[PDB]
Symmetry: D2
């Protein structure tokens, strides 16, 4: 069977024929892959930065149900949930390995579990999210968007601690969010926060790309060029109710944006920084105490968040049609080995999402 395979911790990737019989099966439902998505985590494993001699790559997939089984009919499009539980802890037992207490969960295409960059796989209906045919084209985004749905859900849950965090009109329209770093993560955070009605500023150390300018315009989002720091933003707009670190950057980014967090505010750490050490002095931390600020680590969406993501992607075809049409940057055929290896190995500037087509 054709599969894209990796050999962690070693760098490298192959697109080749493997023995179908030694690949991981998860249930009774046979699913033929139509699309995969690629993201930074795939790039990391391919570049070695994270009885089986290999692992099937890929955790973003849309496939078609080959034969009707229970609630699933032949021809239905489905997406697998990628993180699966440890089987021992109470969070996993209620279907929420995002909060696994043991750390012994599996992650398709990354850890302990064969991924979905293969011709077909067998899965359990419990781990399958129904993808409407009407969002077949952008539906691949439901996996990355699920992470962001969970993250925003969590931020809103935490802010229930504030006696009144709503605005004079009962909404959250008055609350301002700073999304630091663009790319697929920043863009999806922005789209979702605008959908919820919060004001958004996107920030990056440069002017907007064509895609970001469309998002700015269509979603009525603000943009800040942070090339020379954040003083001018603070001077003009003031402080923010929520700040999202969506950069995989140097942790000194946090030193730049922490002074822009307002009273009762939340700093959501979503990106995985891979450089730097950030100094926090007593003045900064004392201020955090006095003003009820919170810093939260945000990771991993689960089935309910994939479903929310499907509804939002559907909404964006109507609300933000121009931005929705830019979520998918390009599609590469599984049969195009040279182009496939290139995109698996490295991101292109201004890439949102690369899709792999099985044919």
């Amino acid at each position: 069977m054709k599969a894209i395979i990796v050999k962690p911790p070693n760098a490298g990737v192959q697109v080749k024929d493997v023995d179908e019989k030694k690949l991981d099966s998860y249930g009774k439902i046979k699913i033929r892959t139509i699309y995969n998505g690629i993201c930074g985590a795939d790039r990391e494993i391919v570049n070695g930065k994270l009885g089986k001699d290999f692992l099937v790559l890929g955790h973003e997939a849309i496939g078609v149900v080959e034969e009707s089984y229970h609630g699933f009919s032949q021809g239905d499009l489905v997406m697998p949930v990628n993180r699966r539980g440890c089987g021992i802890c109470r969070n996993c037992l209620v279907g929420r390995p995002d909060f696994c207490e043991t750390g012994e969960f599996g992650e398709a295409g990354i850890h302990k579990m064969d991924g979905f960059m293969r011709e077909w796989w067998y899965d359990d209906p419990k781990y399958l999210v129904k993808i409407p045919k009407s969002i077949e084209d952008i539906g691949i985004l439901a996996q990355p968007l699920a992470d962001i749905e969970k993250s925003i859900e969590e931020i809103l849950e935490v802010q229930k601690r504030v006696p009144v965090w709503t605005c004079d009109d009962g909404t959250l329209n008055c609350r301002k969010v700073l999304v630091v770093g663009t790319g697929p993560i920043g863009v999806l955070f922005t789209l979702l926060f605008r959908t919820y009605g919060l004001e958004v500023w996107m920030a990056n150390r440069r002017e907007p790309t064509e895609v970001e300018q469309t998002v700015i315009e269509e979603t009525k989002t603000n943009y800040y060029n942070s090339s020379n720091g954040y003083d001018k933003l603070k001077d003009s707009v003031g402080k923010f109710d929520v700040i999202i670190d969506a950069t995989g950057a140097d942790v000194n980014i946090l030193g730049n944006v922490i002074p822009l967090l307002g009273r009762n505010g939340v700093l959501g750490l979503f990106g995985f920084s891979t450089s730097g050490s950030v100094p926090l002095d007593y003045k900064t931390l004392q201020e955090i105490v006095h003003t009820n600020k919170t810093i939260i680590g945000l990771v991993n969406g689960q089935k309910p968040h994939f479903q929310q993501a499907v509804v939002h992607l559907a909404s964006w075809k109507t609300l933000y049609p121009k931005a929705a049409k830019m979520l998918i940057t390009k599609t590469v055929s599984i049969n195009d080995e040279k182009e496939l290896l290139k995109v698996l190995r490295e991101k292109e500037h201004g890439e949102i999402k690369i899709r792999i087509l099985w044919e």
Copy 2:
């Protein structure tokens, strides 16, 4: 009228007769002071570390109602809430200036507002907490305990984000708390967490004092001497679900204890750190993201928290009688000027709470 006065931002304190006419009045109920408490906040203003020429010091008070007004009867004991609202924001409008959005709140005996170290004052029934005569002796602690009630309440609210944070038996008995630092704040966090049933480890850079040893034994709390760091605690007990910084010390303490935070855990910042800069490297921050960890600034209790504190102090006379009887370190007469000025200016080693008695 006899009053203890300060002149911020200037260092210094005086006990003298002042014109009752230039003192702040807050409502129609006349209250004669019986006790005040002293804390580090009083020491700070006295030492200049933070029409009207002066401010009446003091935010911890128990007074007696001199004349029956509405629901308050003559002879009733009351304690005033010390932080009061800005009158503009929605949090203050619902009685919760602990989450004030303007920062224009008042704090009795500290900022904008005359305190309670005076023979008598007038107050509004809405800011008065009823103090049962059966806890007259230890009731002064309800004010500092209120801050801690709010803090624990907030930690538990935030942890509702975790799908299941309860244990196999439906309680929080399996959850472990590290309380860093053991003066009145760390001791009160320990007593309250044990009342809630969580396991507690107190930590200081030394062996316990007598009072602490009484807490250890009576409340079945654990103690760790952190003089040579925390590796041995980590190796023996593992990681903690909650960590409270109850030290007003160098922020590098957080560097020490962050590695001891467990999956889904909460670092509660309560102490007001006065020195240092702590480096947080990418590995630490990445881990925080991967494990859904949270850091929260904890400050200020309000009326419902004062009321909860009364119930808990009452409970401790039965549950923890030895500990409860050590909460009050000493009592100084308002008339004993040399001693009073001494205790206002500086803490004694091992002090928990000093009371000022009006007679």
Copy 3:
């Protein structure tokens, strides 16, 4: 100015020119009406079943902003929130008159407040919901859908009382809802519950209409003909986690469906029952106690719910395109007086929403 007017409690309705100076203004923004919606509440006032000589009818409107104000561009479509606060109670003061504690709120086109069946009106920006031009056709439904958004939000909030109400897969997909009474309210409850992923059964004392059959098939909803009661449904499907009374029917409907409520379940009372008395015996009530059942009165959506409604309407254009195009039964011109009076006075069988167009 042309307006549709009533004189409660008397029966009758007129479409005529009225003096602008007599009509209620609510703010600085001029809005030219383009669409109104008609519902049962309108028919009730028209038929006399519910300093001003008259009241402007109507509480469902979409208008166009006439000038470029702060936040609102000229040509923007907006919808007014219909219930407005009493200005005294804490619920109203946080933008939530749905929970008004005084009952002294106003309801546009019903009580205290001129409605929106007029050429134009002046409003405060705080009461305006933005209606994307991409949902101009079905956007009028955002008002009725808002009541339903609030209702489901409240049901889900209440069900947080159950330690685990989610399913084996972390979703609510395993939860079953019985929606009693089809057409508009029942149809919208069904669409929204299926959007959230819950299983739905619609019930009416007849077979489905053409429109209901579309919704049934496209949303994968079940239908039960309740003409001879509920024994057959109970025997086949069992009991339900949520039951919604979406009928304005005799209260004895509740006696029929209460035996179908499952453990930990919620009976949502949304319809305004019009006759009857229902007996509850001790056996029924003790069983409610034993099984943690809840009965909840559900009324009125506010601004955040209108905004959620807009997102869901947009989603349905892609998720349920056939059903979405059957939401608007027909549009009547404001200038077609004979047909207008007819649709104001009586519902037609199987009607979902009639829209009035201003030209």
Copy 4:
């Protein structure tokens, strides 16, 4: 082994020696019974109103730990949790069989499980609540109080649906509770709500008893003689935010109190009504809809609620010492057969709690 045994559904009760091998064991810890409590449920079984030849009666117990086990020391006092889970559903698996989804749970001394009126039993440490020696005398009340702790917890959780249910001072002190029925349950509800600071009116169809009068005066609670209905209370006091049925009597009591429920209010059904049928008319039900009222079935406390009960009983020894000393009406020796059978068979007027002492 001596044990008190019954044979449901037959009436009758025996205190005799029974074969130890025939009695249910629940774990490895041996617990020697020191006290049991008797309540209405016991009286019902004794009077036959609700593989084994018999069932050991009793679900209210304090026993002594025979050997120093895991976290339990020889001589420690413990109380068993009486309802135990089905082992299948997600609520039972998180330690919360109060919300069991299968109904397959066991109830010590009532259903599927031998009770605790026996010389000793073996238990699992997970089902054991530590009873401080400082509350040995009234600690037996922790089991009935647990049900009430759960109930008030649930009411407060449900009321988070109201945007602001707190008062001008951030507390619930402005909220009024009507407790209908003044037995062990009504008294316990009253004490706990007053502990939480809510205003309470107790109601019964007579003047108070001495015990009740003592509760009334010491807790600053109000009393209403409801012998001639509730019109006079409604006229004098108005309506209530919470109404608790602590009856057991005829369900028509609900018809009488429902008109006294206020906006956004909660009717808590705790008592097990024993007769009658109450009519609810369309006017009553539509007003429930209009005012966001809720009716909730309240049943069963679990381990966290036992632990909260321990803290509150301890608090009452200081807060309400006179009331606390009236909670135990009398103690009967296990060897006093004539008196024992008397108290098992029938309640005495004004009784709160009868305790059985194993001598």
